[PDB]
């Protein structure tokens, strides 16, 4: 038993991290087969940042201007192209440590692990959620751009995030591995705050199921609710609407515990309207919303990769 915010093992991604330098800018790249993926702003200086013309800056670069280092070995660049906000550098060596992988664009509310890197070397790993407002609550310093986020399924690494920027209040924005930003953000140093965030309701419910599985049951009340009446309360507290798809996805946890989803919703309604009164759930004094239903099942059933 026990319940922790748990990241995926990072080794398969570690073997893909490299350093990319263009001029005086160094950041991280992801080396898969014979291509290195990195943020296109590697070709910028600081002054370039208020409003860079990336297409124009890239036309004046050639392959040899990109210094790609995998550990202590330089990888020779033999082609390059831009796809949205990412650069793809073709190198003359395929990465022998390339895992089975996919590029996937995740949905708001889904979680993934981030391998934070500097100069192509890993610093740490932690679990995040794609917030409803398309930011993530990460931990990134200058030099971390190009760090990626990912899920693992068995042997397959699904890359879903590449880090580009920090928005006001210390939250983070980036792209999928096709270079398309999550949310309305752009890779330039201009005012662009995130929309107001919301709480991921289906994940709070999943985490309440995790608490029951772990024997932390004090918040279960004797009532039920309709989906419509629950969502009227969730709205007031800035929770996202719960959909029937969400109810179905909670099915496995509901079946394991014998607690119908709408009964758990009645317990959550009471927590929202009355607070916790100084009590904790799974050691937390706040309701946690960065575990998905699958995260709870994976951790409570010992799924391995």
For residue 192, state whether it binds ligand X83 (rule: CB under 6 A).
Answer: yes
Angle, helices 201-213/293-301, rounded to nearest 10 degrees: 20
Report the C-alpha gap between 180 and 184 in whole angstroms: 10
Task: Write down the least CB distance from residue 167 to ligand X83, Å.
Answer: 5
CA 132 to each of CA 3, 107, 111, 192, 203: distance values in angstroms, whole numbers, following the listed order: 24, 9, 12, 16, 12
Site mask for its own copies (CB under 8 A), range 268-287, x = bound:
------------x--xxxx-
Q: Which of 121, 180, 221, 226 binds its own copies (CB under 8 A)?
A: 121
Q: Which residues are catalytic?
A: 41, 145
For its own copies, the closer of residues 3 and 54 by Cβ is 3
Number of residues that bind ligand X83 (CB under 6 A): 18
The residue to which tokens 């679990």 are assigned: 127
Contact range with its own copies by CB under 8 A, out of 47-55, 72-80, 114-122, 225-233: 114-122
Q: Does 93 bind ligand X83 (CB under 6 A)?
A: no
Smallest CA-to-CA distance from 98 within 10, 9, 12, 8 is with: 12
Kindly state whether residue 10 participates in binding its own copies, applying the rule CB under 8 A: yes
What span, in angstroms and rounded, lies between the C-alpha atoms of 305 and 301? 13
Comparing CB distances to ligand X83, the nearer of 122 and 143 is 143
Between CA 79 and CA 89 the distance in angstroms is 6
Using CA atoms, how far apart are residues 13 and 278, in angstroms rounded to an integer? 40
Length of the chain: 305
Binding site for its own copies (CB under 8 A): 1-12, 14-15, 115-119, 121-126, 128, 137-141, 143-144, 166, 170-172, 214-215, 280, 283-286, 298-305
Binding site for ligand X83 (CB under 6 A): 27, 41, 49, 140-145, 164-167, 172, 187-189, 192
């Amino acid at each position: 038993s026990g319940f922790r915010k748990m990241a995926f093992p990072s080794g398969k991604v570690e073997g893909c991290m490299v350093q990319v330098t263009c001029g005086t800018t160094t950041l991280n790249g992801l080396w898969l087969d014979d291509v290195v993926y990195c943020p296109r702003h590697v070709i910028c200086t600081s002054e370039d940042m208020l409003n860079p013309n990336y297409e124009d800056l890239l036309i004046r670069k050639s392959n040899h201007n990109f210094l790609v280092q995998a550990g202590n070995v330089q990888l020779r660049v033999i082609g390059h192209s831009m796809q949205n906000c990412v650069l793809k550098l073709k190198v003359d060596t395929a990465n022998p440590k390339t895992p089975k992988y996919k590029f996937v664009r995740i949905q708001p509310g889904q979680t993934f692990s981030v391998l934070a890197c500097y100069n192509g070397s890993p610093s740490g790993v932690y679990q995040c959620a794609m917030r409803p407002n398309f930011t993530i609550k990460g931990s990134f310093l200058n030099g971390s751009c190009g760090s990626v986020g990912f899920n693992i399924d068995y042997d397959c690494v699904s890359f879903c995030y590449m880090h580009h920027m920090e928005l006001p209040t210390g939250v983070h924005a980036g792209t999928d591995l096709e270079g398309n930003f999550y949310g309305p953000f752009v890779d330039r140093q201009t005012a662009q705050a995130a929309g107001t965030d919301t709480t991921i309701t289906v994940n709070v419910l999943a985490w309440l199921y995790a608490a029951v599985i772990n024997g932390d049951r004090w918040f279960l009340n004797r009532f039920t609710t309709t989906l419509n009446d629950f969502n009227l309360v969730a709205m007031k507290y800035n929770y996202e609407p719960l959909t029937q798809d969400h109810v179905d996805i909670l099915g496995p946890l509901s079946a394991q515990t014998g607690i119908a989803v709408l009964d758990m919703c009645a317990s959550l309604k009471e927590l929202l309207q009355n607070g916790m009164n100084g009590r904790t759930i799974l050691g937390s004094a706040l309701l946690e919303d960065e575990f998905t239903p699958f995260d709870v099942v994976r951790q409570c059933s010992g799924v391995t990769f």
